[model samples]
Target chain A: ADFKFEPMRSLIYVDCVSEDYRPKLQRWIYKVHIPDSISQFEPYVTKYAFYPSFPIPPQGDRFGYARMQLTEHHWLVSDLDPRLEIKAIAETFPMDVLVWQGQIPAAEGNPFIFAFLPMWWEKDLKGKGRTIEDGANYRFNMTIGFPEGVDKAEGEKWLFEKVVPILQAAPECTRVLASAVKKDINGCVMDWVLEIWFENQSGWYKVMVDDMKALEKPSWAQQDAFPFLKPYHNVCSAAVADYTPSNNLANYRGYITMR
Target chain B: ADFKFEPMRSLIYVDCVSEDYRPKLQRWIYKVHIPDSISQFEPYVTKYAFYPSFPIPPQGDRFGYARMQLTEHHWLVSDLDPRLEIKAIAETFPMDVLVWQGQIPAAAEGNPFIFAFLPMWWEKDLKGKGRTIEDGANYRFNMTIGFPEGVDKAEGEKWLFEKVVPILQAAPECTRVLASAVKKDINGCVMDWVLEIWFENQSGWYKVMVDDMKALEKPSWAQQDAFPFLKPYHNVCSAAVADYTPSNNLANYRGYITMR
Candidate 1:
């Protein structure tokens, strides 16, 4: 069967730290801050998720990451320029912590970072060529670093054999995309990032907190690949800002369509 | 089968002047005020409806009415103590305008209230009584009534069992009744019970209210204690006018009534 693929764009992310007034700054960011900022660049942002570092366990220098899908690099350069609202909001945070933003080509990204036990599984899932902007849904941005001396191939196999199936069958999970850091434009932390979208917050709990406990004592437990997967953090959020030029708001209407 | 019946408690309500701060008050009420207020009282409250006095033909004193149901009257005394929360919130409005509160018997109370018709229909349904307060789904109208002290309990029950229940049962539009005996006497006069009746929709409710108006003028209605039971002189009546789509909770519906 002949399959058609739409062009995939870049996924841009920014990492920064919280300044002096963290709680008050976060309240304003979630409420008045982000919505006021995002409304302007709605067109450049095909889909975007704004995450804060407050909820996650502290392990690295960075606090939170802002992840977005862009139509082109130009959108990233102009609308996403830090001089705009980004710098203004960042000023509320630690100005000295500095902000780092970069882009990774969608093709350069990988659903399963390394190793291919099931080439059949790859075609089975990837053949869908499903666009991430399929709809307006909730997202879970997760980052987990592999321990030193852990083989990358063994890690990928565990994800494919153990983790992938758990996420795939998880309730209300629409799509899962795991990307290995090809280019960290911002000298930031974390080697691997996984972005998963859900129908709503309920589905998010099922995957992150509820079903995740079931994986604690898996057959792979005590094995080389499983034990090294530590200090993982998941940020629950949604794409508050998104814009696709031709589609405009039509791109975000996927939830209604899916429903 | 002898189905046991428990006394339904009074539904307390307040009427106040909207003041110059009306818009901000309502905005806060719908968004922040009610949610914070309702969260603590969920167990006692079967359901609640906040009717704002808005977009109505301009001849009413009520700004809006707060209506709620309790598992029993004890829940009312603690959570509903006006001095604690309700009056405190009312103080933010106009103080001199008299924020009056009162109680009414539920079983004896009628809906689309200003009416009377099909006299025999009341007693028939009353004898073969079935509880209208069914769980789940939605209802058209819920009336919180306050009866005057002159009203006798036996006479009120007869009027309810023989009159209000039958009128409610007769109307194809009128669906159910959840009645309660009043326990708290806060503001004035001894309290009776309160009744909340559900109907099909506005059109059906319109005819019922219209029919109720006609029923009110009947010579027999004047004779019944239930008719004049509520102190007609004082501002004792208030209602929660809302379109409850499903969830019985107040958060589920949009309030139509707003104050000037």
Candidate 2:
């Protein structure tokens, strides 16, 4: 069967000119943007927004904010008006600009395809005398393009079979969104984009150097750690996540399930 | 005229796990391996090697040590043994291990076909410094493109030379693409057409071409007509010019050419 799509999520990529204004910008987000948006939508929109604690490197980094908006209805093809919400975001955070925004299909139940927050952190955040501010982490937005002859079934199968292992082994890699774009905006013409979250840079570093090398060595059934990929396509770009605001104001936590 | 081949090059990929061990390993490579290999064939074996001054990010970076060996003879398919040289290398620099090795082909005189693409954006970017294209060093990008059961040689060549090369040559930013040669991989290890294009620097190869190269697959000749012959999947890889030494290694190369 083809991939099931429900609770379509919109990802907005934020571009900020400078990092010197981060704290004030983040303060405006936590104090004004989220609260004001929730007031506007009341019981309608879903709200979840993320901004990195550390600065993203300009050499490779793209977005400044990664905000999610969820709606039960399929508005991707609909003529729904986001003018009011867009206006609110512009008024609230003028410096943080929206460079890219599009819908991403959900997997399992979560609007985010790949999101992982450790149970220990969730359970012990307050008990360990830590605040939500201490939960600052890194996020990865990886895009995948399938080659000429590959079909949907083959690509999906290859994703679960080959890509999942590397994802699981990635350090502090908690959540991942293996999704397809609903429309083309920015340069996202690829078939799939994997949005991932990590605890910090070291976690990612460990996965890249050690975990990847281990895969390269001869294994029980394979010659290369990622044999399926080299034969398939020529492009894959993985970058750090950015911050933005949700169009929908509803708070969503029930969809956060991980194995 | 097809791209000519005279000197055969061997590329070696070395995987060094940590930067802490880099100096020692590199020292051994220069002191022991290069000298020892050269002493064996002195006037015969040409030597060239490179190690990146800055560390490559481990995520996508697979190899650190890049060594080039040139010999006039086609010893790749020949009985000329490298077992002794390899053994000495292993015994001396145990820490710096050799993970991969393969022979690479060089460009023809004037290097006209591939070199024409570089001048467009090369000088404009100031990435001209430290580049070997002007020095006649080989900067290569290799790809394995597959054709499904339906397409024939004529259709493939028409699409590649007519449609593919023209777009490549048109992009001034793509000036780094030096020479290209294509062959059918009889071994069937990778793909149907084994295509190789040389560039001046790894930066030009990746930054300019990597993401944009996919656009090359979209033209009419590639999709509407010729795609019927090509498999859905294809592969491309880039490399830096780490080492270069002149030797007697020469081959009478005759292959496809899109350049005038």
Candidate 3:
């Protein structure tokens, strides 16, 4: 299949330590923080959206190890220079939310900020190249990491050549990104994510089921390869009313989301 | 409207402190813990089920105040005496899991085994009322609570019936509502209440938490006197909402309701 992968993205994970503090922190985020970012980093950003692990699952379980569920929220920004965007992004939610930063568990990089460059992708049947701006019924941050002895470049090449085509066959797949993140001492912990966005639960289900069927090409086809690849999945829904985009305040319902 | 509220039941809260420990705890739960209970307590237990917070919502978020999400797992059992069932339960996962129980946060009763009684439940509304444990996988929205000093059993029952009952019955998504007053934990930390609502699926959880939340407070009587759902020393945190997707390890799993 022909493909046109997308550009780098700044993934600022605004996670909280306490579940007690989650509601409070998210309130300040949509209400105060992200709004602050829109004004500061908006110029550098083309596509901006946030993902919160709300409506907790079983209707769809987060399929892999995702730092024991500390992904309270992550602000995915498109087309930004982490060099320029990081500080400006920090300056946005820099005040009110940080008063509680003492709580954003250090185990997960204090879970504040991360940036990914050159997330690979495929040109969809829609003819548009992959983009994060589009909202879907379901989406997830699926990460793949290899054993340290294995070089990151070869690992990525193995993914681009071997794995990407497997998921490409599914008809329900709307957009896909072979994410290669830029790491820091405490940021962008994800090694690489082949993030896939689907049209709805049915589409997500079909592609996933199809993935299993394709993989039994000897369970080792995936199970063994995965160990070398080392992957995890955190499922999410973009359809909830609780969230409000920084640029689009009208979507704020002040119910689960505040503003 | 005529009604028959549910009878008393024992709620054993199995919680964890470390996020790292939750997946392990649950693995032992479905794999070993509950299976052990089915045979041991099967006679005393008319119903049994376990609830786990998976999928990590956005399609449906836990609302109200629910112990800051510490309900990594709660084993909802009906018709068992805490005096008896409590000890039996302790022995089941009592060994391997407890080696790590040291990790269960003491703040949340070391994060394990709580028992609630006299829960005000609307039975006519709750489906699978009389069914045994080994029935089917059902979903629910449960909110357990803690009363501050001074509210006696009578007053707490009054609160569940008068306060929470009226509001929940109005919410369409709340197919059934059970508000059991907390008796104490295995550790003897006297608590307040255990409230639950039966639903069809996560979609129903979404309805109450999101779409029809206003319907819950639509009861005219509740709006007038509905006090703060949380307070100082209240064991519960927040309006305390938690979503429950049950594991079918028992015949029927629900809070028992008394006959009118």
Candidate 4:
């Protein structure tokens, strides 16, 4: 069997943060840029997830680790996974990234936002903060293969006028922003992104400070990185298929094509 | 047409209080209670609600009145009238009363508990405290009526064992008392509630002080009688049908005879 990959859409996450945001800009990952972005397409959102990277602990009394659980189901298929990975993706903006040896480097830039990997997990941030518009809204892009015998234009129109606002007003939603890739390879699809941003004074913080010690603090560990910033900001993310690949085999429907 | 009324089962809610509970007992209703004294036949629980005497406006701010949102058949039913009567009950216990108006009546004894006009209505406790157990576990008892031709116990049992637990465990919890009532309620034709109570010490003070205020704050506008205390530790009783006419129609099953 031969496998081919579609050109991944460049969903650029611009790094921006309040002066008081954590790890002093270096440790921040993705700032729920769309402080509650409502999506134009949701029911068609087969899967989605968010991967954030912050210095989380490993064992007893550990702080930064995520206790995540997720599941996805299509017309007659379901997949569930319990995932644990460090630096899943810098969830905070202006995120300082830690590579293999825990070296802090400006990954994307000061106030740099990390990219999301599809299909692992998803998050929806609510009641955390506000955006520049005093509203939390975000728009994510996806590339879906055109399914056979489907009117892609009609689907987009239906979603933009009908589906998007419904999802935005859903009881569980904070806010949502959706758009389609009318540009190129990932054309003819409405990418749904649900988000919430920090509107209040940079939310809550857990400080990693002065000569701090990790339970597994290695001998070659850089001591100066002790005082790291951990944000308990109104944390949330998009769905798994939203973060993973464009298989679109989860909870999505409407004129979508399969690979 | 005329109706004849008689005494059925009697519910005796003692001037109940637990030690070291916080938030000052404003009032208490019940999360789940064991009818240790359940009568020999299928029991009909009538009369529910909390009764608080004198409005609990602390510093001119109402300290959140208690309301019970009972859910059954996808419909949520709540207690309409106050039944526990915390203000009235608190009046009887002078030692614990706080920030209340009225004379510490020497004659106001035994008026701690009030009568419920319905059987079950989201049996939440008042006093804004003690929703969970304290330092240990509490057992709850619920009655289940058999279906008209004696419904298969096996079907009910399946729900009890299979579907209910996962639904409950997946929900976000307030404390460690994590469990669901479905499986237990279905299988045995009665469900037993086993829960652990944690202490939020601040809420206990209000519960304790207010339970006393219920009896002590007797006023001329309304004269409520004294409350009675009884034992077997816990029991359930219905109000005398003659003295208290129940307007709540949903309190009883439709087909069951109101009185036998």
Candidate 5:
């Protein structure tokens, strides 16, 4: 069963040309860009989360830009007269330096894992590790892959049942959203994207260290199964979002969805 | 033997009151705050690095306002007085809201490990994990601690020779600085702090996962040794600073040391 949590979800990857521009860019995104979106998309937009990509050099070049992929994801729950293009929602958030599809210098290195990808999964266990509105300061994202010859159905079962539960059991594991990749996500050898949120900085470290038992092979797991399945992972924080919207503001989002 | 790399080093803990004020705070620190200091503290302030503390809730109150401690550390090489207070260099960085020593709401929580403790160790293996010029976008910090009854000198040897060497061998490791605590640093049940810098982030996770052999107990290690010594660890990015100073700017920093 595909997790039918939100009507619309958007992903955007971004970074700047130089370090000097970050303060202004970050300030603009947090204060001007997001607040105005709240004012405009208030009625329909239910959850808004912002993530800053790792501040390291982009590895090689992917999709013509060193912009790391899937740095920003927004869950916009809406009630429209008809289904509209996710582009309109993604349009509101514009960047002077959008990673993949924007102007990028060759010197910056390859940044995008998927220049632009949207996975509409039918059967997925969206990592809702903890029952919360939405909004966590830290996110531990993982790209999962299996050993050779492992079928999709087999690997996915290992993910949803065995892998996802390990994170849920880890202390401070708040929201766990796991889903198998639907389409080709460019150079991404992995099949699943698991985004985990924690209460503090040590939360992910707990998963690798103190919470070792969670990574141990489950009794029901198949052969050649490595407890650690993620091919790629990174930690991000400094998150801001309004998950529990209500009253006039919620109503404002309501009116926006009318058209 | 202690690493005699720099004459002076400083650490300042910071953050702001509300989400609305971060822009102004950040801008001031980057452009106006740091620029002016560089204008004044040029040559002497050889290196300046800024790190944003993790934007999460304060963990059950340590030194004070939940600011994840020592997020900002700097190498202010000087050549004026025989030995001036590190406070003089630290004062250049004044924040509207400083953790541990600022007005924080009870609801905010404990944020400090050593509110105002200066660590002065003559024996340490400062993690110069990488041969960096002094600027990196990320830091992987670890605090070394061992099992019950583990002595300081022994624990420290384990950290520098065993733990720190592993990080250095990692592919992307650029800088590593480690040292044991001098005095009481509060409920920080640890003896040393290892601040590490890398070319990128995955280098850190690679150190933890791929570079497992570096963590293997050395033949010289005692029976009660644990491969991992860091009681606390965190990943920080979005780094910016100046490591190499030139003619004009270096001279300006020289003048500041003359007066203040």
Candidate 6:
């Protein structure tokens, strides 16, 4: 079997748009999706959810927008979600499109991927305190494709064996950031800050073996934070929700669930 | 007759209590001395500059607080000014146990390396100007060691060549971010924002190539910012120089230069 992990560029044609949802979508992709994905595979996933949005240029009155795209095998452990959709002009097929669907087991060590998406609309200006759903729709699309290296059955074995365990380790760590505290006395704070770092010396010896085992680079680029650029570029935010409502202010977020 | 590009690692000891340029000395050593010494190789000097006042850690009694070190070498670029300093101790050292001070020119690129120590102090206060010379005294020691391949006068020429040019290219691009369009009149405005993005893309390509070819990796394991930790983070009122000259403006950057 062959499993290729290459980023394929393609255009995603979405027919709907949202005013309230755009900024939130941007945050989910940049702050949540990208960071979480890369955190899972390290250098294996170099860039993720890099949604650089700009109006498609108009040529002689025809509207055109370039859809920056990327594709890779859906490692069930790293990415767990099923509803995958690819909407394009049905005819002009882009070459080398990798699409995986159907049931794939969650890799062993990783946690079940929380691929959740939800939608909301602005309160109607007509004073109904309700929304009109016809204008636009918001949701997420995820597909799982088997890479070339593994057969279907073996890939399934790997998913449950490896992926989920890695993902389960994510929660406590994510909670540390999401809770934004070392010892949670009270969840009274409004903002949660997650600060996670990786060391160069980790016990991946079995995988690395010796001084010369070729591996994909990790996603996080270890560099000094660009003070000059970061302040000006953009700010993305995501909330790790809490389910059990507590007596503290954070309990408000505790009620949140991934839609 | 020969230049061999090789990799190296070392430790950088920072003395927080010792004031910069107070009494002792600060220094650095590398493969080649740079422009003046290497005349035949002057044309090939791609990235060369001395980074002054790069960030050092706090002088606390905590274990492992003395040395600012690095292991990997991916972040090092070939041809660029060394003046820009990342202040956080963790930010500066992303690789190993010591601060690395050399680069190998990847291909046939003429790589000239140069470094110099400066009287420097790092303050987390953005509102306040840099530490007053009196209060901000610290000691710093640096060295430059070159790797010259056999039958070669230097080491890693190919690596050096590939890294520096893009860094030089990045300088002008960073300058573009500070490009100002003051409207004296409403004639029109020339925007360089798009131009800067395109330039950054070019720079990104260089970084990508450098990482791929050298099998380099970044080794930072902390999320450090202005101050090492969030506590006691200094907030300052904008200061005026002598007269009310705003020093915080990006226009103040004159770019990099050195006197012969």
Top lDDT prediction, candidate number:
3
lDDT rank, highest first? Answer: 3, 5, 1, 2, 4, 6
Candidate 2 Cα errors over 4 Å, as ranges? A1-259, B1-7, B13-21, B46-164, B180-207, B218-237, B242-260
* Chain B TM-score for the candidates in order: 0.49, 0.42, 0.49, 0.19, 0.40, 0.18
How high is the lDDT of residue B31 in model 5? Answer: 33
Q: Which stretches of candidate 4 lie over 4 Å from their true place?
A: A1-259, B1-217, B220-260
Question: Residue-wise lDDT of candidate 1 within A1-259, one digit each (tens)?
Answer: 4222221223333322223434443344343433333444444544434333223222222212332221122133333234444432222333221221112221221121111011022223221465655766565545444445556577666666777677788757776766653323333234445556666656666665566556655343333222223321222122322333323222221111000
Question: What is candidate 5's lDDT per residue for A127-223, written digit by digit as tens?
Answer: 4333444555455454444545667787677667766767767656766665554333234445655556666556655663456454556443332
lDDT (Cα, tens digit) per residue for candidate 5, span B1-260: 33234444444445354565566565455434443455444444555555444433222121122232233323433222334333233424444434223334333443333221224332455445344544554444333223324445665555556664655555444454444442333223333332333323544444443355455654343432333422222111112222322322222211111000
lDDT of 3 by residue, B109-137 (tens): 34334444543343334333464335444
Docking class of 1: incorrect
Q: After superposition, how far is residue B19 of candidate 4 from its true place, in Å?
A: 19
lDDT score, candidate 2: 0.36
Task: Give model 5's clash tally.
Answer: 38
lDDT string for model 4 (B60-154, tens) is: 11111111211111111212213312222122333443212111232232222222222111222211122312123211111111111233556
Per-residue lDDT tens digits for candidate 6, residues B1-260, read: 43222111111223222343212222211112222222322233211222233233232211112212211111111212233233222222222111222122222221121221110111111111222222222222122222222313222323323442234234432211101111212212111000001112324323322332234222132122221111110110000011012221111223233459
Per-residue lDDT of model 1, residues B38-57, tens digit only: 54454444445443422221
Each model's number of backbone clashes?
30, 34, 36, 134, 38, 91
Question: Per-residue lDDT for A187-216 in model 4, tens only?
Answer: 322233223221221121111121123223
Q: Give the per-residue lDDT digits (tens) of candidate 2, residues B12-123.
A: 2343334554555555645555555544443332223342322332212222112222111111121123333343333354522331121111211110011001000111
Best-matching candidate per TM-score: 1
Q: State the weakest 10-residue window (summed lDDT) of model 1 chain B.
A: B111-120
